[PDB]
């Protein structure tokens, strides 16, 4: 009876969430038409976490699609599993932010958020208990970053005691898909640190490495990256949707993975990822997944975990398994490389067990890691912002929408403060 | 009432998505590389 | 919905647009009468029962180029009163087209713009097609952009203007007309795209291997540049790029908005079967200096920002792989203050080929438009040639008689001086 | 549960192990697909020594295939029993060694050896207990000689308490497959003396004589030659894979056969080699097995046993055998010719019994001999080295990768030291 | 992946290449149009759907031989821009091929290897074909190897080169071009193979039994020599040898890299039935001077290193026995410091007979490449005739007019002079 409200923002958020809602609907066994066709009573035991009951057995998701370009909302309704979402949740604009963080937040976003806030209030007050809010967006954009972080500010000042899981795709240091990546990202982090309770960091080049090195996929397309991100988000909330031996909901991971309130950026990789030619050769055991769990290449963040010590790590094992084999492997990794973990918080990595695995999987695990190794990623965005701000390049679009010079200095201020605190605990 | 949606590109062997790769079905298929990343199976001597 | 109004000024605007609208009908299946046997909404208007009318006006003081469209094979596609004509042309004079003979025609033009603006729900931009070498495209072109800015504030306009070549000049007063034309291109247009004739001439003789190309062959492939740029509003893909997206990614400074253009795969018919069309090599062909649509060397300057309009069956990993190899090569130079310099946009429909055209059917396509500091030498050769003819006061008495006086040559000159110091100061390392 | 991790290096090393995993799986009963089809419980009792259990009854060998030319991995994959190996274990490069020891050890070795040790440490840490590593290579080439000795020196630093069983194909006196055979051998033997715990010397010219005199084979291919060495490699570990009356594992033979750490090169022979015509005539008894064991032509090394005295020799008898003819025949070979044995060791020869014979054969035995007669094999290659080194022939290629002339002198200095030590105890 | 780029300079290079690419299509089933009805990666790149384009360039100053490829039966096979032409020929002038009319083509050439370099994954070597007798083969050949050295360092450029014969020569100015081109050939080419026309004339007369051979019949068996040594990269064998295998095993000193060549069963159609071709017999016939590609007696010198490439049903024991028989024989003499004088290479695929050719279908063939001390007798021959013409200063005003000065001939003479002492020093016992 724990509910989380799902909100998708921007082209990145709408595309990831559409593939995300396909997976959890496939996991819960509901057809794209909207009825139920699964063969287990455990699937229907907890559907209220993601679905609202409707007349005739229809299960409408708790999804609110919010964006600027109407082509994006036309894309999700055209594809499969696009008829499950209610059109009353299809709030959208016409102008398009054009990757302008100032346009999506201050000028244009005022005329849309008042419509979005009414919709998310409708979904919140319908359910009895709000576990939290799960939003998906990116940081380099302007539709999902400027307007998405505006939603985080307004929904936290009205719901202050509820969780906030943000799955954000940060800009890649290696490759730039837009020109205004550090302008949008540093302004988005400036809003997310005081408002978002738990922030998840994704990036495209880490998804591309997994699909080539581990998964060995010839043509990893645009939708293949979202499927692994979808596998992440179905793994975080495995305690809410399914019973488990040791329970770990969103607040369970909130108190465990967050030592200090500013340090909440995490990084997650999915464990049983193998190539199609190597499925029959590998033996799936608890030590086998654990070795793949702590490898640097299996992580969906380009931050190198060998560089920075782990403050706190969490694992969400799924399936029928021996509980100390999960436990002793956490003790096994604590002793083999103790320097890679932090000292003043002893016994960093700690786990949970759920007895319901995903479909077709005998065993799986979702690993959440709060490490100080993420500071090298943020300073890469920070050094790009400082290089561009000294010449004030690509800036007159931002100040044309009502953004003064002070907001960029404050955005660089706490960005350097955030990487200072991560570096301070690394010593 | 909408937009023209052309076919999203599929490389080879009809790999529609990560359904088999994740959910452990249709194993034994071809891969991108087995040794050095440049080479591929069924290509060689 | 995504709406764009394409105005066509001067003879070069009509001839490019006549080839541009040839390609638009074949892409969306529109029969030339206007009867299709929702992608058409970007350039065509739904009209009653099975009729589509373009969202364009063909305005030119010269009647003979407009009347070719009226008697041509597209007599029924276009609205009859969109094709605004005039009595006599501007005679390659900026003074006539902007002051005397263009005043009574531009008032009829804004009436046509308002009716086309009310029909469309959400207008996203203006694609102006003209040449700065002629009187009509410069004089009336500057006049049209003045009234459009005050009538429609903060709304994007894209300028595809053909500039004179350093070696080939079809008229004598082209340096005079270009300097007066570029006075308006700074403060009014938000995006200006440089074009040049002899560079596209050089592409056709080498890539298309045609020995004596005509203006029709130049106009058919510049249409492919426009259609690749606007393909995101019509056809969706992995990474859509809006028209309003272009201004934020390609205009770092308000007076720096001139951009080069390049269409990467330009392959003739028999050439294509032997050629391996790959994402990596097409991206490498995009940055090759002879593939530039403007006669300029990108090696002289440094790239400020770039946008890559990918089309066809392109996986987003390969463009990611191609961009990484582009950054590693030392032959190109990026400016020091812009580490994130690439915009990538993938569309999922390959570009159609017109029957009888030189271009062959290709599965992939990359349109390369970049803001560069190498564009400064293109304005310098026009600046130096302007001051040579102005030194002894040649071809001034034509401009003096019809409205303009001797002062306006000075402010047009010194505004280009402010432009020349803008490119050199910004491109200089700090 | 005494595991052996197998590594194959180079063109010759990949081909010798291709027939090795074909023979040892045929003894244990694994089909080329991977399932088990044996008719005895004892075959599956000890399969952990060479195979890893996988999901669905699949067995994967503890084999790492390494080289620099992708032609040979095409050869082992297209050949029979080539699908059993792990696809992740196919670690190699694309440049090709080109029969240069310096290239195989210095230039491309830096990028290759980093990835290979990750595969090897994965195989070693998977099993509970290690017995040693069984590597196979040649000393005339560069793809397995320089690269293999780089691996052997690196793996002994990581695991100094585990033995190193190496198989080397040394250059021929009569012929030469490569022009730089003395250069490749003298540098490789300089590395094998301090890293490899014991070496078993093989060569084609002794195998060619065996394939024509005893076997009477019309067309001995390299597939024919590979089976003779591979039949030994099954017989060395027969006490590990099978229970036996007198067990002798890979450390049992190490302390018995090796008097001094520098003297660890052996001459090897497989005993019950018969032609197809003479199968019915020869009666498989131990006394006639002993005379074929101690025949000079049956040795698979070109060094003639009659020239030098045996320091210590060992026999690995297999089959249902009683232990007087195991002992009296080894006693009789002492008293029949005592001049051919070292005086200061009483009962130089040695034997052990495993009661499980190979497939289809009643009695079998594998002979290991550590004799001082192998000095002329090292004397000849040292003689061939000093002739080329004085004129500096074929050295501008070797010094190109970064080998100075001092290392060639040090390699030759160890050859004269090693050949004198064998002559020291011969007198 | 393994692949080699073939480069053919000059009329001798193209005509061998016409015979070469005739042969390479037969092992891979490629029709002349280019459609196979995956071992072709060494020579063919899979382009599009079912079309293979050769990994070659046909560059020549004279257009009269490259258009024969264009108008011939292999029009569709080769890419059209791949074949490089020129306005005028070198007219057997090394100065024209290197300085005056050679620089304008080599810039276009290096852009074409570069695109074949990016298309291919891991390059094994370059196979360059030229003849030192002509100005195109010498001049453009000397330029092209120099540019590949500074662009692709330490890549094994394995060369096949045609040299003037003593008895029969086709041009007066051959000794001048041979000495000049050799000076560049020492410092650039890693592995070079010696070819001479009159020895193949004796081969066609004695073994193949043709009274009047033509240049087409010469290159047909030359292409068999090229295909046999590269067959190891294409098809798997017992003892494979790569391009990098040859240079580290047949080059004892960095300037002593002039290896001889020989072929085995050069046997006509009716001669094949009665001949008992065995591994021992074909090895003995390989080392005979009758089967040598170059008119030089190997009995005068010592074999420093020899490599045998076997194709077909070769058991490894019989080639192991044939090594012992040659070394035991007193007539074949080796140098005293190289006991390991031989290298064996066994491939499993027999050579493919060209239909309509003079060679017969044979199960077994051996390509004998040997590094001897008898090559210096060829270079003592070229040194003597070069000094005869240079004494009276004949045919020098053609060269010094076209860019060169007098000094290049003396330095090329001294550099080639040090070669025959180097071949004498390496042959003398110590
Ligand atoms: N790309 C392209 N450019 C053209 C074409 N036709 C003419 N031009 C350019 O236009 C220039 C001629 O001046 P215009 O701007 O066309 O003259 P105008 O606008 O008609 O003004 P008036 O001639 O006075 O009526 C030439 O220098 C060409 O560079 C064409 O078909 N394609
Ligand atoms: N083996 C072989 N040699 C040839 C053939 N054709 C010509 N040659 C030799 O090549 C020599 C000249 O080679 P090239 O440099 O290629 O001649 P070219 O390219 O025409 O040079 P120019 O005459 O200056 O234009 C002649 O002396 C011939 O001996 C041929 O078809 N096969
Ligand atoms: N993994 C993944 N990344 C995406 C997806 N869509 C967009 N992105 C990333 O988001 C960035 C562009 O953001 P954008 O869509 O313009 O944000 P918007 O302004 O909210 O629409 C690029 O760097 C992409 O890599 C997606 O479906 N999956
Ligand atoms: N027994 C056997 N020996 C081989 C085989 N292939 C090559 N050799 C031997 O290996 C030697 C050449 O070494 P090489 O393969 O070049 O070593 P590499 O440089 O590591 O590849 C020759 O003397 C051959 O006798 C094989 O399949 N079986
Ligand atoms: Mg006109
Ligand atoms: Mg010629």
mmCIF file of N, CA and C in Angstrom, chain E residues 316-357:
data_model
loop_
_atom_site.group_PDB
_atom_site.id
_atom_site.type_symbol
_atom_site.label_atom_id
_atom_site.label_comp_id
_atom_site.label_asym_id
_atom_site.label_seq_id
_atom_site.Cartn_x
_atom_site.Cartn_y
_atom_site.Cartn_z
ATOM 1 N N UNK E 316 53.756 -32.383 -43.386
ATOM 2 C CA UNK E 316 54.908 -31.676 -42.799
ATOM 3 C C UNK E 316 56.167 -32.516 -42.659
ATOM 4 N N UNK E 317 56.079 -33.845 -42.736
ATOM 5 C CA UNK E 317 57.293 -34.649 -42.658
ATOM 6 C C UNK E 317 58.108 -34.555 -43.943
ATOM 7 N N UNK E 318 57.439 -34.548 -45.098
ATOM 8 C CA UNK E 318 58.162 -34.554 -46.366
ATOM 9 C C UNK E 318 58.879 -33.235 -46.619
ATOM 10 N N UNK E 319 58.294 -32.115 -46.190
ATOM 11 C CA UNK E 319 59.029 -30.858 -46.246
ATOM 12 C C UNK E 319 60.144 -30.856 -45.205
ATOM 13 N N UNK E 320 59.949 -31.563 -44.087
ATOM 14 C CA UNK E 320 61.011 -31.698 -43.098
ATOM 15 C C UNK E 320 62.141 -32.571 -43.627
ATOM 16 N N UNK E 321 61.816 -33.560 -44.459
ATOM 17 C CA UNK E 321 62.861 -34.364 -45.082
ATOM 18 C C UNK E 321 63.571 -33.602 -46.193
ATOM 19 N N UNK E 322 62.852 -32.729 -46.904
ATOM 20 C CA UNK E 322 63.452 -31.998 -48.016
ATOM 21 C C UNK E 322 64.426 -30.928 -47.539
ATOM 22 N N UNK E 323 64.240 -30.416 -46.320
ATOM 23 C CA UNK E 323 65.227 -29.520 -45.721
ATOM 24 C C UNK E 323 66.557 -30.238 -45.531
ATOM 25 N N UNK E 324 66.514 -31.488 -45.067
ATOM 26 C CA UNK E 324 67.747 -32.223 -44.804
ATOM 27 C C UNK E 324 68.480 -32.576 -46.094
ATOM 28 N N UNK E 325 67.740 -32.854 -47.170
ATOM 29 C CA UNK E 325 68.380 -33.260 -48.419
ATOM 30 C C UNK E 325 69.119 -32.102 -49.077
ATOM 31 N N UNK E 326 68.566 -30.892 -48.995
ATOM 32 C CA UNK E 326 69.211 -29.741 -49.617
ATOM 33 C C UNK E 326 70.474 -29.356 -48.855
ATOM 34 N N UNK E 327 70.405 -29.346 -47.523
ATOM 35 C CA UNK E 327 71.549 -28.918 -46.725
ATOM 36 C C UNK E 327 72.683 -29.932 -46.775
ATOM 37 N N UNK E 328 72.359 -31.221 -46.894
ATOM 38 C CA UNK E 328 73.393 -32.242 -47.023
ATOM 39 C C UNK E 328 74.104 -32.147 -48.368
ATOM 40 N N UNK E 329 73.407 -31.668 -49.395
ATOM 41 C CA UNK E 329 73.984 -31.570 -50.728
ATOM 42 C C UNK E 329 75.081 -30.512 -50.765
ATOM 43 N N UNK E 330 76.185 -30.844 -51.436
ATOM 44 C CA UNK E 330 77.355 -29.973 -51.440
ATOM 45 C C UNK E 330 77.188 -28.776 -52.370
ATOM 46 N N UNK E 331 76.379 -28.912 -53.426
ATOM 47 C CA UNK E 331 76.253 -27.844 -54.416
ATOM 48 C C UNK E 331 75.590 -26.604 -53.827
ATOM 49 N N UNK E 332 74.508 -26.781 -53.078
ATOM 50 C CA UNK E 332 73.890 -25.667 -52.369
ATOM 51 C C UNK E 332 74.748 -25.354 -51.151
ATOM 52 N N UNK E 333 75.367 -24.181 -51.148
ATOM 53 C CA UNK E 333 76.290 -23.784 -50.097
ATOM 54 C C UNK E 333 75.692 -22.636 -49.301
ATOM 55 N N UNK E 334 75.731 -22.757 -47.980
ATOM 56 C CA UNK E 334 75.234 -21.739 -47.070
ATOM 57 C C UNK E 334 76.397 -20.939 -46.510
ATOM 58 N N UNK E 335 76.069 -19.831 -45.869
ATOM 59 C CA UNK E 335 77.088 -19.036 -45.200
ATOM 60 C C UNK E 335 77.411 -19.704 -43.869
ATOM 61 N N UNK E 336 78.646 -19.516 -43.398
ATOM 62 C CA UNK E 336 79.147 -20.295 -42.272
ATOM 63 C C UNK E 336 78.499 -19.925 -40.946
ATOM 64 N N UNK E 337 77.913 -18.735 -40.829
ATOM 65 C CA UNK E 337 77.369 -18.286 -39.556
ATOM 66 C C UNK E 337 75.864 -18.478 -39.441
ATOM 67 N N UNK E 338 75.229 -19.164 -40.392
ATOM 68 C CA UNK E 338 73.785 -19.398 -40.352
ATOM 69 C C UNK E 338 73.499 -20.881 -40.550
ATOM 70 N N UNK E 339 73.545 -21.685 -39.484
ATOM 71 C CA UNK E 339 73.155 -23.096 -39.632
ATOM 72 C C UNK E 339 71.672 -23.275 -39.894
ATOM 73 N N UNK E 340 70.826 -22.450 -39.276
ATOM 74 C CA UNK E 340 69.380 -22.524 -39.471
ATOM 75 C C UNK E 340 69.025 -21.705 -40.707
ATOM 76 N N UNK E 341 69.331 -22.273 -41.870
ATOM 77 C CA UNK E 341 69.205 -21.539 -43.111
ATOM 78 C C UNK E 341 67.845 -21.540 -43.768
ATOM 79 N N UNK E 342 66.880 -22.291 -43.247
ATOM 80 C CA UNK E 342 65.619 -22.497 -43.938
ATOM 81 C C UNK E 342 64.429 -22.118 -43.070
ATOM 82 N N UNK E 343 63.340 -21.748 -43.740
ATOM 83 C CA UNK E 343 62.031 -21.557 -43.133
ATOM 84 C C UNK E 343 60.981 -22.234 -44.000
ATOM 85 N N UNK E 344 60.097 -22.997 -43.365
ATOM 86 C CA UNK E 344 59.051 -23.727 -44.061
ATOM 87 C C UNK E 344 57.699 -23.078 -43.800
ATOM 88 N N UNK E 345 56.896 -22.969 -44.851
ATOM 89 C CA UNK E 345 55.534 -22.490 -44.731
ATOM 90 C C UNK E 345 54.580 -23.360 -45.519
ATOM 91 N N UNK E 346 53.608 -23.965 -44.845
ATOM 92 C CA UNK E 346 52.705 -24.931 -45.457
ATOM 93 C C UNK E 346 51.299 -24.355 -45.437
ATOM 94 N N UNK E 347 50.685 -24.252 -46.610
ATOM 95 C CA UNK E 347 49.290 -23.868 -46.732
ATOM 96 C C UNK E 347 48.496 -25.011 -47.347
ATOM 97 N N UNK E 348 47.219 -25.093 -46.981
ATOM 98 C CA UNK E 348 46.405 -26.249 -47.324
ATOM 99 C C UNK E 348 45.677 -26.119 -48.655
ATOM 100 N N UNK E 349 45.692 -24.949 -49.288
ATOM 101 C CA UNK E 349 44.945 -24.785 -50.524
ATOM 102 C C UNK E 349 45.879 -24.794 -51.722
ATOM 103 N N UNK E 350 45.627 -25.647 -52.710
ATOM 104 C CA UNK E 350 46.464 -25.676 -53.915
ATOM 105 C C UNK E 350 46.277 -24.415 -54.739
ATOM 106 N N UNK E 351 47.249 -24.065 -55.585
ATOM 107 C CA UNK E 351 47.097 -22.875 -56.431
ATOM 108 C C UNK E 351 45.958 -23.026 -57.427
ATOM 109 N N UNK E 352 45.314 -21.902 -57.724
ATOM 110 C CA UNK E 352 44.172 -21.878 -58.625
ATOM 111 C C UNK E 352 44.640 -21.552 -60.034
ATOM 112 N N UNK E 353 44.297 -22.420 -60.978
ATOM 113 C CA UNK E 353 44.709 -22.240 -62.365
ATOM 114 C C UNK E 353 43.843 -21.169 -63.018
ATOM 115 N N UNK E 354 44.484 -20.276 -63.756
ATOM 116 C CA UNK E 354 43.748 -19.294 -64.559
ATOM 117 C C UNK E 354 43.195 -19.989 -65.798
ATOM 118 N N UNK E 355 41.891 -19.907 -66.066
ATOM 119 C CA UNK E 355 41.349 -20.527 -67.281
ATOM 120 C C UNK E 355 41.833 -19.793 -68.523
ATOM 121 N N UNK E 356 42.286 -20.564 -69.508
ATOM 122 C CA UNK E 356 42.927 -20.006 -70.677
ATOM 123 C C UNK E 356 44.404 -19.731 -70.512
ATOM 124 N N UNK E 357 44.958 -19.950 -69.320
ATOM 125 C CA UNK E 357 46.363 -19.709 -69.089
ATOM 126 C C UNK E 357 47.242 -20.853 -69.556
#
